[PDB]
Symmetry: D2
Subunit: 468 residues, 4 copies
């Protein structure tokens, strides 16, 4: 039923005690947009400290109930929340494109992860166990992972529904309550999750939503009842690679999610030999990318999050030119054929060549559809030039020589490495966010630890053996 250029927020954007609320006090006022049209979908209040307090006080209450429920009881509520998400998928995914701008194509994948995540932690809640050790003389010791209490989740604008799901699913599975503060850019989708949790059977206050910016964030972090607050990538193309897969990989790595992720492999090192053929093919393919209405099934490139952000990306390209880069295609305002999209935050995906490491476009993360093609001669050279990469990053190597691939992956300091592919998936996702992957056992174990604490009990069955 929902379409581009029509949506307007009618209900309030805060959520406490299982219902939408207007904030009790303000830290300011913000406007949320429809990036495809430039339309204001909401003018909303940012939570003040009294408001922040009410939300924390409310979830503190819900925490006390939820923490007393068994893992099995919590598992059913969470599996239900996933069923509702799965059912209302197209509705949710639409709301997501409307406020964020990503393709319905991508937005659905985001929602798939979202319910998959909930099913994962629901499972873990039901199969939770501690350690038990037998001590000499019938005495024994045991452990239990207890929830922390009221956790704060800070959202991002690039994966709004998915970040909300990803933070709250392990949090609530542990028996905690969450107060979630989404990006002021994207305040809508989180309320859909909040509503779904209530519908699933979560006690009122367990997943609360406070809207706001920096001040709000600070008020949440400064709250005494808050237990815990939960808050360039290279692509090496060797001459011996499968050119078409390398080109496909480069495009995926740079233009998925409009290149508005830090995950994106924007530094494209291409070996001297294949440099000319690669560049020619990459420009050809980029010029075919479908820019338009994110709700259209054929659209692969939507608008950028907002006007300031778009201006910044266009600014990057102006400097890129100034510094000596050769704009091969795009990097300019795109005026879509449909007049409703006239004032949307659109631009054409950019491919830059003749890039050097000293260049700010090579140095800084742009957060837009901009590919920087850097030439290289030898394996030893790339590895020196590319190794300045943080562990929180990803790297991708394209070569038919398996030994070279493993050798390069071994030397690269990036946490996630892809041989003969590239996936633009969020950091949290295990196994580079490959589709039929699963989460394995370690991802959950580690994140469960983040949202819980280990209680240790020692039972003495005999007499105390005094040293004195």
């Amino acid at each position: 039923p929902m379409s581009t250029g029509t949506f307007v927020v009618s209900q309030p954007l805060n959520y406490r005690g299982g219902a939408r609320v207007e904030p009790a006090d303000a830290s300011g006022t913000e406007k949320a947009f429809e990036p495809a049209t430039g339309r204001v979908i909401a003018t909303f209040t940012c939570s003040g400290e009294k408001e922040v307090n009410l939300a924390v006080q409310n979830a503190k209450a819900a925490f006390k109930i939820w923490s007393q429920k068994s893992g099995m009881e919590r598992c059913r509520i969470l599996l239900e929340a996933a069923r509702i998400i799965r059912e209302r998928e197209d509705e949710i995914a639409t709301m997501e494109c409307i406020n964020n701008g990503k393709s319905i194509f991508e937005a659905r994948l985001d929602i798939d992860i979202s319910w998959q995540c909930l099913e994962y932690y629901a499972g873990l809640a039901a199969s939770m166990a501690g350690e038990h050790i037998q001590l000499p003389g019938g005495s024994f010791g045991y452990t239990r992972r207890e929830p922390l209490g009221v956790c704060v989740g800070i959202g991002a604008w690039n994966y709004p529904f998915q970040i909300a799901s990803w933070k709250s699913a392990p949090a609530l599975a542990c028996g905690n309550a969450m107060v979630f503060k989404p990006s002021p850019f994207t305040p809508v989708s989180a309320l859909l999750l909040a509503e779904i949790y209530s519908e699933a059977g979560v006690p009122p206050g367990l997943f609360n939503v406070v809207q706001g910016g920096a001040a709000t964030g600070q008020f949440l972090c400064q709250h005494p009842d808050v237990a815990k607050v939960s808050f360039k990538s290279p692509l090496i193309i060797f001459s011996d690679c499968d050119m078409n897969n390398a080109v496909k990989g480069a495009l995926m790595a740079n233009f998925l999610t409009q290149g508005q992720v830090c995950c994106n492999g924007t530094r494209v090192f291409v070996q001297k030999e294949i440099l000319d053929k690669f560049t020619e093919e990459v420009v050809k393919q980029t010029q075919r990318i479908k820019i338009g209405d994110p709700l259209l099934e054929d659209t692969r490139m939507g608008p950028l999050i907002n006007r300031p952000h778009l201006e910044r990306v266009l600014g990057f390209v102006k400097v890129a030119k100034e510094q000596g880069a050769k704009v091969l295609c795009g990097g300019d305002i795109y005026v879509p054929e449909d007049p409703k999209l006239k004032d949307g935050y659109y631009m054409r995906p950019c491919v830059l060549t003749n890039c050097r490491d000293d260049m700010t476009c090579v140095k800084e993360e742009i957060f837009g559809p901009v590919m920087s093609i850097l030439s290289f001669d030898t394996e030893a050279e790339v590895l020196e030039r590319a190794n300045d990469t943080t562990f929180g990053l990803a790297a991708g190597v394209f070569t038919r020589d398996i030994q070279r691939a493993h050798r390069v992956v071994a030397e690269l300091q990036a946490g996630t490495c892809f041989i003969n592919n590239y996936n633009v998936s969020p950091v949290e996702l295990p196994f580079g966010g490959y589709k039929k992957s699963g989460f394995g056992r370690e991802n959950g174990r580690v994140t469960i630890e983040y949202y819980s604490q280990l209680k240790t009990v020692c039972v003495e069955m005999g007499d105390v053996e005094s040293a004195f």
Copy 2:
């Protein structure tokens, strides 16, 4: 061998490239003592930034070698270091008492926990494995825990050799290098570990030692080549009227006077139910007055001296104010003069038992870090749980009651991370299962600490063609 009142440091107290070194740069000077005699066992230089740099740079080099060795190779070196520790146990344990002041009795247990810890991580290094996930079309994904690089370990004075062992073992078993900064109170014992690691086959620079205080610590933390820095209401004891009095008294004494009560672990807030209050107090004072104070090297000694004179003066200060606030000193809390004249200038005091304690009292509010027991009276279960729930998760609590339901009910309500039913153990925070003897570490303790000293690398191998969205 070594005896009390005779030891003096002869070699330098820093350690780089497998040998003892004098610091290149100076950031002041410190004196280390023999707490049993008051003697200066060392006047040493506090490492300067040029020195800190050398130690980090040396470890960075050693890291590059070690990180390339298999878990199996790393395991043999670590199992060897544990064998040497176990063999030189009394030598180590004695060197520990000489500088720290704890009884040889307790010092040995500390050393047992040190070699046990090394054998544990050695085992984990050899049995390390990642995840391997199969993907559609023959493509696959896998994971690897890699070391972080050069890790900094900051020591404490209460468990000097044990803190050094506890930080270094998980670090070195991940393939990391370590630069260790002991407490300038207890500089000596760490060098013994450093020597042992070299002897075991650790590459030169893998476990380096830099002496110093705050400045030295700051230089280590500020160093760009340092990957990670590992650092270091009051603990209650609830005694119900239905408990086994003798075990409760034994437990209270253990909880307050082990390690001279110089740990934050110690259960110093002793809540006693109104009925048993009089009998408990009478028995606890009787038993406390029997505690053997003296030479920590003596096998019969259960109470040694306090770490230093400023620290002793502070504990004596707390007692002075406690009686000013209205507490009743039942025994001790005064300067003790041992029979032994070599022991004359040692930092000794008689273990203290205080009664008529109120929650408003600073002795009940603040952690003293001395042998001082605060006895607080209570009437009901509901009352204690209110009064004693202002306890942090990083603390420990002990409950004494013959009613099993009550015990579990109390343990459930208490916010402490480690709870003991019908006992109390004063073991460091790091130790799983309340540091009970012959316990083991289970699997989770190691898993969690390995995570602290490592990072997860993920690799995705594509067996087919790239599926383009465009």
Copy 3:
């Protein structure tokens, strides 16, 4: 909509390729009953060699498809099958009672386990991973748990739907196909599971059902394409003088008369201490005489009929001999005729309590599989432990004492696999944590059972040159 004395089987009772089928060949013919009425609900064909072959061949086909689907795809199908089970719960629960005889009360708990179990393995299928080990010089090794192929599941009559689900869900989560062979006593309920799996989205043949007895079982075991066949002193209850009498009596009744006492899990050897013997016996008889015997479909019914006429004749046989051997029948152990004339020919009897029992007695020696309690007197802890430790590990035991030390000491000495302190649960063997309600399964139960239905494939990738010994 379904009721007692009305139901008759209309469709065939074998399942192949997503539909009910009549067996291709016969190994014989059986009659399935309504135990509450004595009615024949179905006269069915036992599967012959050719039919067993067809089900295996059909499952082999389904296996090839399913095994190629990801754990995530298999997880959705299983989570769906659990949703359908949960939704049609009362329909299945009812159908279960009609053929088996257990109370609708107990039948629901069985069905709750069924869908809980499917949700568990669905979770495990989605989170499956192997090990990845790094080797010198960039070479690597990894592992994967692969399904075995076509597995066979053999049913029991005491938990027909539950044991059907318990065997199918793990085998299928591994990516296997299964051929289930229900007890010829209880053929019906399994077909409901088979139908649900189809409805969920399992490929036709993934979970086939072949009816039959021993010959069908033999044909399944002898089949060359069958990868694995999954099959299905007496349990004591020590009641000490210092315990909580009412909980001990409640526990004794639960332990003996749940599932009409037709489980091997049931704690039928009740050791009672000489002192409390008289009070316990008096209370247990009083409570037993209050047990509601009748229509299993009635919500108030706690005791239904026994599985069949031969089965009942056997239990009453054991009672006849028990009094011949010197036992004192305190209540029941006789043919019961319910007030509802429809239940006139059902397989009913009054729950029995026997006293003055000796270890030499066959009622104490043999498992009866009926509502019969054997009360044995004892004087001391040392005595019981001697008399009761002729217990196999595949059994359960229960101890009632207020002395925690005594409880743990007894549990430690007892050779039973599952021990209950101050309670008793009659849950199937498979169930972790004594089948307590809000328990969960933990991680180990699943790990171990996944290993049963899978095999470890190991792959070694050489990145360098082969190092020849020659």
Copy 4:
């Protein structure tokens, strides 16, 4: 100090209560040999039932003690036993060759695994923990892995000390006692382990050794106090695009390590039509260079076969292979070493056969000798059909530079252990194809610990019983 052609057993060959003992009764008598010389190193008594009973009764006692010790204590004893093994390594390896015939080279690697195994299980004993589940109303449930009791371990002659270590190390880490029956071929080495365990601090009767054959094995299995009894063709696909030298190295390793007397050995060598001639030429060249002789010599890579009947059987297989139409390219004949002490040793030259057919018994049956069967093939589809008749308990090795092909072949192959561009002749028990600096990971021990233990479950009720009635 020990050498070939000198050793003779002087002490008895059973071990009970921390001592070597002569069997109380007999199930027969066997002769043990020095395969390098043909010498009888021992004429010993096979254990009767009274003797088996004594070993079990003694082990039952030691169990009751060992099972009551902490996993922490057990771990120290086991880490000590590994230190002693590691220290007396050369003595043990020497003794192993003397009775078995394998090279000092391989015999050491066997002993390395042996002490590595013990260190692994020692670690697991110390870090053992059960599950603890919280239940509504303060009630709780927990689990513990308990030992089974007296376990029986049946040895093999190909890895005598290693099989003993591999069975005893997990069982003893659990808290069980073990009665071990070595192969009547290889009695000696197991007693060295039994002695080391005692020296380490194991209670007397915790690891007992009863010498014997089938009757003795049967007596052990039939014993009511015995809790559990633990008991003991592989293809190699060479594609034309492979690295020839690594493929040849791999083929030799796969066929002639341990004198080819393992079921692990990749004896069916499928070679592509194109590289067939170059491969065959190189493999024969390399095989003819293998150093046959005194297993105690550091340069020796091929020792003698386990015994005369076994050698005759392998020579028999070669006779029939050429009768069936195979082309003997080298060896497969009685070898007479230059050293006269070795004159009556059970030696033969490693054999390479070509013109093999799938119908041939040498391709069908496991030979247990140094015999390589070279089979030609044209396409990937063909090999995969011909080689798929492989059991999961087997290994397979693929050699190809095409990574896609390698994974594709490994995926289709039914073998449990697959190697890409290598082949390792390691026992079945070993995780990650028995690669040297591999480790054991965590699953191998978990699964084996389960074999030698049982899960005890305890449920503590903190409240009142909720009666259905």
